[PDB]
Enzyme design. Structure first.
Site, PDB file in Angstrom:
ATOM      1  N   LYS A  50       0.849  -1.342  -0.035  1.00  0.00           N
ATOM      2  CA  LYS A  50      -0.004  -0.147   0.092  1.00  0.00           C
ATOM      3  C   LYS A  50       0.938   1.318  -0.026  1.00  0.00           C
ATOM      4  O   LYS A  50       0.389   2.350  -0.193  1.00  0.00           O
ATOM      5  CB  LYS A  50      -0.989   0.139   1.075  1.00  0.00           C
ATOM      6  CG  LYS A  50      -2.090  -1.252   1.321  1.00  0.00           C
ATOM      7  CD  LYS A  50      -3.017  -0.960   2.549  1.00  0.00           C
ATOM      8  N   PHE A  91      13.160  -5.304   3.273  1.00  0.00           N
ATOM      9  CA  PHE A  91      14.225  -5.801   4.163  1.00  0.00           C
ATOM     10  C   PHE A  91      13.590  -6.543   5.217  1.00  0.00           C
ATOM     11  O   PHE A  91      13.736  -7.705   5.232  1.00  0.00           O
ATOM     12  CB  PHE A  91      15.267  -4.879   4.691  1.00  0.00           C
ATOM     13  CG  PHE A  91      16.161  -5.000   5.619  1.00  0.00           C
ATOM     14  CD1 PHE A  91      16.778  -6.311   5.706  1.00  0.00           C
ATOM     15  CD2 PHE A  91      16.407  -4.017   6.668  1.00  0.00           C
ATOM     16  CE1 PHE A  91      17.801  -6.627   6.852  1.00  0.00           C
ATOM     17  CE2 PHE A  91      17.115  -4.557   7.757  1.00  0.00           C
ATOM     18  CZ  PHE A  91      17.627  -5.703   7.868  1.00  0.00           C
ATOM     19  N   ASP A  96      11.406 -11.322   7.985  1.00  0.00           N
ATOM     20  CA  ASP A  96      10.418 -11.863   8.874  1.00  0.00           C
ATOM     21  C   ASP A  96       9.625 -13.019   8.331  1.00  0.00           C
ATOM     22  O   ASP A  96       9.208 -13.929   8.744  1.00  0.00           O
ATOM     23  CB  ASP A  96       9.651 -10.547   9.124  1.00  0.00           C
ATOM     24  CG  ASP A  96       8.565 -11.062   9.942  1.00  0.00           C
ATOM     25  OD1 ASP A  96       7.260 -11.084   9.464  1.00  0.00           O
ATOM     26  OD2 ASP A  96       8.623 -11.036  11.267  1.00  0.00           O
ATOM     27  N   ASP A 100       8.953 -16.302  10.484  1.00  0.00           N
ATOM     28  CA  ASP A 100       7.791 -16.671  10.794  1.00  0.00           C
ATOM     29  C   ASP A 100       7.073 -17.887  10.078  1.00  0.00           C
ATOM     30  O   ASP A 100       5.976 -18.250  10.165  1.00  0.00           O
ATOM     31  CB  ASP A 100       6.832 -15.369  10.589  1.00  0.00           C
ATOM     32  CG  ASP A 100       7.311 -14.398  11.646  1.00  0.00           C
ATOM     33  OD1 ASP A 100       7.966 -14.671  12.435  1.00  0.00           O
ATOM     34  OD2 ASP A 100       7.017 -13.301  11.567  1.00  0.00           O
ATOM     35  N   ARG A 105       3.016 -13.154   0.882  1.00  0.00           N
ATOM     36  CA  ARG A 105       2.987 -11.553   1.288  1.00  0.00           C
ATOM     37  C   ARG A 105       2.558 -10.913   0.135  1.00  0.00           C
ATOM     38  O   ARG A 105       2.943 -11.183  -0.995  1.00  0.00           O
ATOM     39  CB  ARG A 105       4.574 -11.476   1.545  1.00  0.00           C
ATOM     40  CG  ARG A 105       5.109 -10.042   1.435  1.00  0.00           C
ATOM     41  CD  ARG A 105       4.422  -9.213   2.734  1.00  0.00           C
ATOM     42  NE  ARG A 105       5.234  -9.935   4.073  1.00  0.00           N
ATOM     43  CZ  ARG A 105       4.653  -9.735   5.098  1.00  0.00           C
ATOM     44  NH1 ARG A 105       3.778  -8.443   5.396  1.00  0.00           N
ATOM     45  NH2 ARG A 105       5.416 -10.245   6.253  1.00  0.00           N
ATOM     46  N   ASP A 167       9.602 -10.206  20.057  1.00  0.00           N
ATOM     47  CA  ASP A 167       8.732 -10.910  19.384  1.00  0.00           C
ATOM     48  C   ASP A 167       9.348 -12.607  19.714  1.00  0.00           C
ATOM     49  O   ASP A 167       8.446 -13.495  20.032  1.00  0.00           O
ATOM     50  CB  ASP A 167       8.656 -10.336  18.212  1.00  0.00           C
ATOM     51  CG  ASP A 167       7.656 -11.296  17.265  1.00  0.00           C
ATOM     52  OD1 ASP A 167       6.443 -10.843  16.967  1.00  0.00           O
ATOM     53  OD2 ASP A 167       8.026 -12.298  16.646  1.00  0.00           O
ATOM     54  N   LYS A 193       9.012  -3.241  17.701  1.00  0.00           N
ATOM     55  CA  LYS A 193       8.892  -4.085  16.413  1.00  0.00           C
ATOM     56  C   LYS A 193       8.398  -3.160  15.446  1.00  0.00           C
ATOM     57  O   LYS A 193       8.628  -3.425  14.282  1.00  0.00           O
ATOM     58  CB  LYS A 193       8.481  -5.520  16.410  1.00  0.00           C
ATOM     59  CG  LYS A 193       7.164  -5.553  16.437  1.00  0.00           C
ATOM     60  CD  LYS A 193       6.786  -7.075  15.844  1.00  0.00           C
ATOM     61  CE  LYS A 193       5.115  -7.480  16.041  1.00  0.00           C
ATOM     62  NZ  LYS A 193       4.901  -8.715  15.914  1.00  0.00           N
ATOM     63  N   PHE A 232      -2.004  -0.007  14.903  1.00  0.00           N
ATOM     64  CA  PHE A 232      -1.625  -0.640  13.879  1.00  0.00           C
ATOM     65  C   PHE A 232      -0.991  -2.011  13.994  1.00  0.00           C
ATOM     66  O   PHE A 232      -1.732  -2.800  13.240  1.00  0.00           O
ATOM     67  CB  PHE A 232      -0.524   0.198  13.026  1.00  0.00           C
ATOM     68  CG  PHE A 232      -0.053  -0.372  11.777  1.00  0.00           C
ATOM     69  CD1 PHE A 232       0.823  -1.344  11.468  1.00  0.00           C
ATOM     70  CD2 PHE A 232      -0.897   0.149  10.520  1.00  0.00           C
ATOM     71  CE1 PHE A 232       1.102  -1.634  10.262  1.00  0.00           C
ATOM     72  CE2 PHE A 232      -0.548  -0.693   9.422  1.00  0.00           C
ATOM     73  CZ  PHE A 232       0.291  -1.629   9.326  1.00  0.00           C
ATOM     74  N   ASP A 236      -3.184  -5.283  12.810  1.00  0.00           N
ATOM     75  CA  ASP A 236      -2.273  -6.440  11.995  1.00  0.00           C
ATOM     76  C   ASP A 236      -2.388  -7.902  12.679  1.00  0.00           C
ATOM     77  O   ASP A 236      -2.722  -9.135  12.021  1.00  0.00           O
ATOM     78  CB  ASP A 236      -0.854  -6.015  12.227  1.00  0.00           C
ATOM     79  CG  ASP A 236       0.174  -7.111  11.152  1.00  0.00           C
ATOM     80  OD1 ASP A 236      -0.123  -7.226  10.149  1.00  0.00           O
ATOM     81  OD2 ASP A 236       0.715  -8.033  11.914  1.00  0.00           O
ATOM     82  N   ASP A 237      -2.420  -7.968  14.124  1.00  0.00           N
ATOM     83  CA  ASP A 237      -2.756  -9.285  14.988  1.00  0.00           C
ATOM     84  C   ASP A 237      -4.055  -9.818  14.744  1.00  0.00           C
ATOM     85  O   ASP A 237      -4.429 -11.176  14.189  1.00  0.00           O
ATOM     86  CB  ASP A 237      -2.391  -8.989  16.286  1.00  0.00           C
ATOM     87  CG  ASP A 237      -0.926  -8.600  16.679  1.00  0.00           C
ATOM     88  OD1 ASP A 237       0.122  -8.774  15.584  1.00  0.00           O
ATOM     89  OD2 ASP A 237      -0.807  -8.429  17.850  1.00  0.00           O
TER      90      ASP A 237
HETATM   91  C1  LIG Z   1      16.678  -8.082  10.879  1.00  0.00           C
HETATM   92  C2  LIG Z   1      15.287  -8.238  10.470  1.00  0.00           C
HETATM   93  C3  LIG Z   1      15.150  -9.510  11.184  1.00  0.00           C
HETATM   94  O1  LIG Z   1      14.432  -7.485  11.472  1.00  0.00           O
HETATM   95  C4  LIG Z   1      13.258  -7.343  11.259  1.00  0.00           C
HETATM   96  C5  LIG Z   1      12.450  -7.928  10.411  1.00  0.00           C
HETATM   97  C6  LIG Z   1      10.897  -7.685  10.489  1.00  0.00           C
HETATM   98  C7  LIG Z   1      10.392  -6.862  11.542  1.00  0.00           C
HETATM   99  C8  LIG Z   1       8.944  -7.003  11.551  1.00  0.00           C
HETATM  100  C9  LIG Z   1       8.267  -5.737  12.137  1.00  0.00           C
HETATM  101  C10 LIG Z   1       6.933  -5.705  12.297  1.00  0.00           C
HETATM  102  N1  LIG Z   1       6.160  -6.417  11.361  1.00  0.00           N
HETATM  103  C11 LIG Z   1       6.674  -7.414  10.903  1.00  0.00           C
HETATM  104  N2  LIG Z   1       5.708  -8.363  10.243  1.00  0.00           N
HETATM  105  C12 LIG Z   1       4.489  -8.560  10.540  1.00  0.00           C
HETATM  106  P1  LIG Z   1       3.573  -9.307   9.150  1.00  0.00           P
HETATM  107  O2  LIG Z   1       4.164 -10.644   8.905  1.00  0.00           O
HETATM  108  O3  LIG Z   1       3.684  -8.454   8.123  1.00  0.00           O
HETATM  109  O4  LIG Z   1       2.139  -9.686  10.014  1.00  0.00           O
HETATM  110  P2  LIG Z   1       4.641  -9.655  12.300  1.00  0.00           P
HETATM  111  O5  LIG Z   1       5.293 -10.793  11.885  1.00  0.00           O
HETATM  112  O6  LIG Z   1       5.492  -8.905  13.476  1.00  0.00           O
HETATM  113  O7  LIG Z   1       3.124  -9.997  12.761  1.00  0.00           O
HETATM  114  C13 LIG Z   1       8.005  -7.602  10.770  1.00  0.00           C
HETATM  115  C14 LIG Z   1      11.064  -6.414  12.516  1.00  0.00           C
HETATM  116  C15 LIG Z   1      12.429  -6.530  12.481  1.00  0.00           C
HETATM  117 MG   LIG Z   2       5.399 -12.148  10.045  1.00  0.00          MG
HETATM  118 MG   LIG Z   3       7.143 -11.784  12.626  1.00  0.00          MG
HETATM  119 MG   LIG Z   4       1.481  -9.699  11.552  1.00  0.00          MG
END
Ligand SMILES: CC(C)Oc1ccc(-c2ccnc(NC(P(=O)(O)O)P(=O)(O)O)c2)cc1
Ligand SMILES: [Mg+2]
Ligand SMILES: [Mg+2]
Ligand SMILES: [Mg+2]
Ligand SMILES: CC(C)Oc1ccc(-c2ccnc(NC(P(=O)(O)O)P(=O)(O)O)c2)cc1
Ligand SMILES: [Cl-]
Ligand SMILES: [Cl-]
Ligand SMILES: [Mg+2]
Ligand SMILES: [Mg+2]
Ligand SMILES: [Mg+2]
Lengths: 342, 342
Positions: A50, A91, A96, A100, A105, A167, A193, A232, A236-237
């Site tokens: 977005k 990045f 992530d 995860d 995505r 996290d 985060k 936000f 997201d959660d």
């Molecule tokens: C070096 C790298 C590993 O660092 C990071 C990579 C990703 C993130 C981060 C921060 C906030 N949201 C996300 N993604 C979300 P999303 O996967 O888009 O739902 P989350 O997994 O927290 O639910 C990733 C924070 C740090």
């Molecule tokens: Mg994630």
């Molecule tokens: Mg994550």
């Molecule tokens: Mg999420």
């Protein structure tokens, strides 16, 4: 909607980003193949979202800088810096998604799940990060705010990675962690985060770019933006599980991944001893039927309706903080962002 | 040996690095657990190597800065910046070991292979990178060379990740890539992946710290250091297979991982059509017996003796470049490093 206005244009400036980042190839043909890979990584992982964080820089910039000062060069720098926030996001999301165990995505398979990519995405992700600093050098090196922008991006990254650490530590694979899933803990995780990079960073960058450097002004903006970022992440959660995947572009993994989600925290506050046991037996595991029990527990406790109420109270709370803390900045800077997220 | 002299001291300053990096915990207790994880990541992944890249900063610094200017503060900054190069290395190696499917590093199991770590190491690795910039801010922010150091570390990282990209692209899993394994390609890979960060960066940093900022002086140093780095990576490749693992602390994965190693390049230059076929059938695969055939082919072509000769000619070549390009810097700066690597 000031974002929908500025968007087409923002998105159009991506081909110049890519052109400038792939010109290293002129000086040094030997790195041709790498730069080609870089282009593919950018095209795949920086496009399709977005663009809210990137556009926030451009929007804020337009609103904070006297229009007589908005010459062609200054605008181009603004869009470039917006694109830096987008590259930071790309990045983050590429790495992530690996951590995860995600599948999709932005409506396509995750970069790391592409055949022939796999864990090479680790390097891809870091290349996106490096592009931020190359862009800043290329476009902003002579500007009085250059060092300010560099430090802001670096510091925002450190904070976000501390977030990510919290996290991951709160969500160990194979271990029941329900005791750890508190409101206090949740708020810390999401501040670090999500809230710094997604809310504070783009507005701060635009602030610096307008020569608004003061510690008190940054801190006031921050009070508003970190609370917005908390909401936000909570949204997201909620959307990880209850969102419509044709809209979200991503399949949820929070329950499987044993995550300290806003959902599980709210569940825990409301559960009987018996429902506590259902959660304990079913949470943090790969089995589809176990994930479905958790969802059914959430629905039985009316969590979607708890979220809807929370969205209402939070919105009010953030608007209150805008009344308190916007000045001397235009309230519109914060309002147009809130509209976008709520 | 000027390194063995400065070492104990360098290594002792690590507990202050860790102390300073874990003081964020004072201001913000909510990130306590993350900082604790950071300490564990530092203790595991920044200690146990030879510290040559970090020590190069300290050694060069002592030799380049008038001893009257070496006050307690300046020394501490020097050691801090050496530790930045070591943290960069630790970042790189933690992520590399994941990408190369490695087992051990510095005589212990790779961080990512530890039970309960796994792909969370991606974040760990990036946290090590962030620590670099926090250290620079904490110790050098008021120094005239601050921006110079920041940009040098950023740029060195970009170049190294371009390197790594070339490495990964030249070595696709499941595909025969022998045609791609040329001397020309090899030299590019290693210039980018190894030579900038392991040789140019620490000397340049010490140069900047001594106020030696000139483009010609940096470029001359660079001619020497990138050729040294080429030899160091070639030695690294030889040692992946022929090194004594109780000395190297790491098990080799180049043949399995289908890598453009110096070995395979030299093999290709010397192989009959029949030996070409043995390589083609056996290279880039997980099976121990297939890896052993490749090794036996290398031994049959006397590659260890080809390496020994190459070490001799390269050493001479680098000493020639020191005669050409050291001035006005002390030759000792380059000589003590060469001694260390050859
Ligand atoms: C070096 C790298 C590993 O660092 C990071 C990579 C990703 C993130 C981060 C921060 C906030 N949201 C996300 N993604 C979300 P999303 O996967 O888009 O739902 P989350 O997994 O927290 O639910 C990733 C924070 C740090
Ligand atoms: Mg994630
Ligand atoms: Mg994550
Ligand atoms: Mg999420
Ligand atoms: C972002 C991160 C993935 O970037 C990098 C990580 C690691 C490297 C790198 C550079 C030079 N040597 C290594 N490791 C050696 P080593 O595993 O120690 O033999 P190589 O795997 O090239 O044979 C890693 C370069 C870039
Ligand atoms: Cl939805
Ligand atoms: Cl050895
Ligand atoms: Mg390796
Ligand atoms: Mg490697
Ligand atoms: Mg190696």
């Amino acid at each position: 909607d000031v974002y929908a206005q500025e968007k087409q244009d923002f998105v159009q400036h991506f081909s110049q980003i890519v052109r400038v980042l792939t010109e290293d190839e002129m000086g040094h043909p030997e790195i041709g193949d790498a730069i080609a890979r870089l282009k593919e990584v950018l095209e795949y992982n920086a496009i399709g979202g977005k663009y809210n964080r990137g556009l926030t820089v451009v929007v804020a910039f337009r609103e904070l800088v006297e229009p007589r000062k908005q010459d062609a060069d200054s605008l181009q720098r603004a869009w470039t810096v917006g694109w830096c926030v987008e590259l930071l996001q790309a990045f983050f999301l590429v790495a992530d998604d690996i951590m995860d165990s995600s599948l999709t995505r932005r409506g396509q398979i995750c970069w790391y799940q592409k055949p022939g990519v796999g864990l090479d995405a680790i390097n891809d992700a870091n290349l996106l990060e490096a592009c931020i600093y190359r862009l800043l050098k290329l476009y902003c090196r002579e500007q009085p705010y250059y060092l300010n922008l560099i430090e802001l991006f670096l510091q925002s990254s450190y904070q976000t990675e501390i977030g990510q650490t919290l996290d991951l530590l709160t969500a160990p694979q194979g271990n029941v962690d329900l005791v750890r899933f508190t409101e206090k803990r949740y708020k810390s995780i999401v501040k670090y985060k999500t809230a710094f990079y997604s809310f504070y960073l783009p507005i701060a960058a635009a602030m610096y770019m307008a020569g608004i450097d003061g510690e008190k002004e940054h801190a006031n903006a921050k009070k508003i933006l970190l609370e917005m970022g908390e909401f936000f992440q909570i949204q997201d959660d909620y959307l990880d599980l209850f969102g419509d995947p044709s809209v979200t572009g991503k399949i949820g993994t929070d329950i499987q991944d044993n995550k300290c989600s806003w959902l599980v925290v709210q569940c825990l506050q409301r559960a009987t001893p018996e429902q506590y046991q259902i959660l304990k037996e079913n949470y943090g595991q790969k089995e589809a039927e176990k994930v479905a029990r958790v969802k059914a527990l959430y629905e039985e406790l009316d969590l979607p309706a708890v979220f809807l109420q929370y969205e209402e109270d939070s919105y009010s709370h953030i608007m209150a903080l805008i009344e308190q803390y916007a000045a001397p900045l235009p309230p519109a800077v914060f309002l147009g962002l809130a509209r976008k997220i709520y």
